[PDB]
Design an enzyme around this catalytic site. Structure first.
Site, PDB file in Angstrom:
ATOM      1  N   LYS A 105       2.518  11.722  -3.878  1.00  0.00           N
ATOM      2  CA  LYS A 105       1.328  11.127  -4.500  1.00  0.00           C
ATOM      3  C   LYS A 105       0.297  12.156  -4.998  1.00  0.00           C
ATOM      4  O   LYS A 105      -0.476  11.872  -5.910  1.00  0.00           O
ATOM      5  CB  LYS A 105       0.655  10.161  -3.524  1.00  0.00           C
ATOM      6  CG  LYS A 105      -0.404   9.261  -4.138  1.00  0.00           C
ATOM      7  CD  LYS A 105      -0.802   8.181  -3.148  1.00  0.00           C
ATOM      8  CE  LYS A 105      -2.001   7.375  -3.619  1.00  0.00           C
ATOM      9  NZ  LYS A 105      -2.434   6.378  -2.593  1.00  0.00           N
ATOM     10  N   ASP A 150       0.854  -1.176   0.000  1.00  0.00           N
ATOM     11  CA  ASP A 150       0.000   0.000   0.000  1.00  0.00           C
ATOM     12  C   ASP A 150       0.901   1.241   0.000  1.00  0.00           C
ATOM     13  O   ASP A 150       1.493   1.574   1.022  1.00  0.00           O
ATOM     14  CB  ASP A 150      -0.931  -0.005   1.223  1.00  0.00           C
ATOM     15  CG  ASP A 150      -1.877   1.207   1.263  1.00  0.00           C
ATOM     16  OD1 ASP A 150      -2.106   1.847   0.206  1.00  0.00           O
ATOM     17  OD2 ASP A 150      -2.407   1.517   2.362  1.00  0.00           O
ATOM     18  N   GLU A 154      -7.520   0.763  -4.462  1.00  0.00           N
ATOM     19  CA  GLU A 154      -7.530   0.731  -2.989  1.00  0.00           C
ATOM     20  C   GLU A 154      -8.815   0.182  -2.347  1.00  0.00           C
ATOM     21  O   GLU A 154      -8.722  -0.674  -1.469  1.00  0.00           O
ATOM     22  CB  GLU A 154      -7.142   2.114  -2.404  1.00  0.00           C
ATOM     23  CG  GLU A 154      -5.646   2.393  -2.558  1.00  0.00           C
ATOM     24  CD  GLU A 154      -5.230   3.861  -2.425  1.00  0.00           C
ATOM     25  OE1 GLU A 154      -6.059   4.715  -2.010  1.00  0.00           O
ATOM     26  OE2 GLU A 154      -4.042   4.143  -2.739  1.00  0.00           O
ATOM     27  N   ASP A 176     -13.405   4.950   1.392  1.00  0.00           N
ATOM     28  CA  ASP A 176     -11.949   5.059   1.545  1.00  0.00           C
ATOM     29  C   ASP A 176     -11.497   6.531   1.524  1.00  0.00           C
ATOM     30  O   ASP A 176     -11.382   7.143   0.461  1.00  0.00           O
ATOM     31  CB  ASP A 176     -11.260   4.257   0.437  1.00  0.00           C
ATOM     32  CG  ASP A 176      -9.731   4.340   0.483  1.00  0.00           C
ATOM     33  OD1 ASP A 176      -9.137   4.585   1.561  1.00  0.00           O
ATOM     34  OD2 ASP A 176      -9.107   4.155  -0.589  1.00  0.00           O
TER      35      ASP A 176
END
Length: 520
Positions: free
Chosen positions: A69, A7, A174, A197
């Site tokens: 990211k 992850d 994810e 999420d």
């Protein structure tokens, strides 16, 4: 060999392995089951990754890098990139129209890094964590991305893996990974599962069916620039203005001051999950003077309420696209660090008319867990069977037609892999090249959607207008990444049709330059 699941998160990363029947989240060299997505270069020339990089942020802020990211696979002029720049201590500069990260690497040597190289360093740390735990070389991995990541963001994450020396066997979304962690060893017929999420940087909602090891995504929607980082920014903003009103000083000058406040805002947010007040205390905040303030849970909620409330819109959309009502949802699974915020839990529970989310899910570890399971499925060393996954593309792919119009080609929520063909011809006599613009998004005009790429079909043989017949095939692979190929189908003298593009992504040459680097 052994395939691990990583992850790769905005603020924290996590690595796991599925073998001998069971899933194991691997602890790093400091005993932490999650690692900060931070890289640093000390004045003395030493590169730090993870906990060591994060714990020297406030003393070496210009040469400490994080939040890569939220930069990856974007352009410099992107309003999201320009928002974040205000709160980041390291220099972000334009190069090839992309945002690159400039730092001093030690011994006063300036260097410019792509966001992919920063994420590659984080992946290298996670790989070495697994190599220590397993006692062998790890060359293969499954790596996560937000479900709503576009084509460029996906490819850029794969490239980061390649730069890290990993064969990225799969890119898994994810929420799908989180659903695997939840649904693995459920044996109770078909169930409709909604995954919510909200991490440190991105937001995803996915609606799935789970039935005795068979997982299928029905619909997905989200926002790739909405998470913990935005909530922290709103609080940092409130206190920068507050300090200015009290002292007449603009701490936007000093990077140490801004990142000292970041560090304390992070701790205050954590405390506000189980208490209603928290004290912000900074010794030597700005020019030797100290900072002392209180943040209530109500103020924190007040500063972020628009952002919190906006997370309900993607939930409404997936229900509409899935053709399901609220009462059809059998289970709600909350993952991502920001789901620990009480107000987020209240909004979700009230939207579903009082329904409690599932217990037994650690929101920081659940995604890595499922990533580890998917990794094991792709290896004969680790595959148990009884695990089938069908995922979808998040965005409608279309081509620009006359008038700047978005002509749909592959609609959103189509199962992948998939492909679609279309025949193109020429508009004038002896036209050597035909240009095709591919866009991602749901709006009717291409101006309001996102440009995936400009593709040129070159080598078209001389003929009158409308005579050539070029079949162009658009394939979305299992990773969610587009490939475009072309064949000449005409009734005459043919040629190999070569496709070039305007896409800004890294070439294998550039990756080889970076892979044959970073040993410095």
């Amino acid at each position: 060999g052994t395939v691990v699941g990583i992850d790769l998160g905005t603020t924290y990363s996590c690595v796991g392995v599925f073998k001998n029947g069971r899933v194991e989240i691997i602890a790093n060299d400091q005993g932490n089951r999650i690692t900060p997505s931070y890289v640093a270069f000390t004045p003395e020339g030493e590169r730090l990754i993870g906990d060591a990089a994060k714990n020297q942020l406030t003393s070496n802020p210009e040469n400490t890098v994080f939040d890569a990211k939220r930069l990856i696979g974007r352009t410099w002029n992107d309003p999201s990139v320009q928002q974040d720049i205000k709160f980041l201590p390291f220099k972000v500069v334009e190069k090839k129209t992309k945002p690159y990260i400039q730092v001093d690497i030690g011994g006063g040597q300036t260097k410019t890094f792509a966001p992919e190289e920063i994420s590659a360093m984080v992946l290298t740390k996670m790989k070495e964590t697994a190599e220590a735990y397993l006692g062998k070389k790890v060359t293969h991995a499954v790596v996560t991305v937000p479900a709503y990541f576009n084509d460029a963001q996906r490819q850029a994450t794969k490239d980061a893996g390649t730069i890290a020396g990993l064969n990225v066997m799969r890119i898994i979304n994810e929420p799908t990974a989180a659903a695997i962690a939840y649904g693995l060893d459920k044996r109770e017929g078909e169930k409709n599962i909604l995954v919510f999420d909200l991490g440190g940087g991105a937001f995803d909602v996915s609606l799935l069916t789970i039935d005795n090891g068979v997982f299928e995504v029905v619909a997905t929607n989200g926002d790739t620039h909405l998470g913990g980082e935005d909530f922290d920014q709103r609080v940092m903003e409130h206190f920068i203005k507050l300090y200015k009103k009290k002292t007449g000083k603009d701490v936007r000058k000093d990077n140490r001051a801004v990142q000292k406040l970041r560090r304390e805002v992070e701790k205050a947010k954590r405390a506000l999950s189980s208490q209603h007040q928290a004290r912000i205390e900074i010794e030597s905040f700005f020019e030797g003077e100290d900072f002392s303030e209180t943040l209530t849970r109500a103020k924190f909620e007040e500063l972020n309420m628009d952002l919190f409330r906006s997370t309900m819109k993607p939930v409404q959309k997936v229900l509409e696209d899935s053709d399901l009502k609220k009462s059809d949802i059998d289970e709600i699974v909350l993952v991502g660090g920001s789901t620990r915020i009480p107000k987020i839990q209240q909004l979700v529970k009230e939207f579903f008319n009082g329904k409690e989310p599932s217990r037994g899910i650690n929101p920081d570890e659940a995604v890595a867990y499922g990533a580890a399971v998917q990794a094991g499925v792709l290896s004969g060393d680790q595959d148990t069977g009884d695990l089938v996954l069908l995922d979808v593309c998040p965005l409608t792919l279309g081509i620009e037609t006359v008038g700047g119009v978005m002509t749909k080609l592959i609609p959103r929520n189509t199962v992948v892999p998939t492909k679609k063909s279309q025949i193109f011809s020429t508009a004038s006599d002896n036209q050597p090249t035909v240009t095709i613009k591919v866009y991602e998004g749901e709006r009717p005009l291409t101006k309001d959607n996102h440009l995936l790429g400009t593709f040129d079909l070159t080598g078209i043989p001389p003929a009158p207008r409308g005579v050539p017949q070029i079949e162009v095939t658009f394939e979305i692979d299992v990773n969610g990444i587009l490939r475009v190929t072309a064949e000449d189908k005409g009734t005459g003298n043919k040629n190999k049709i070569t496709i070039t593009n305007d896409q800004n992504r890294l070439t294998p040459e550039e990756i080889e330059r970076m892979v044959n680097d970073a040993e410095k």
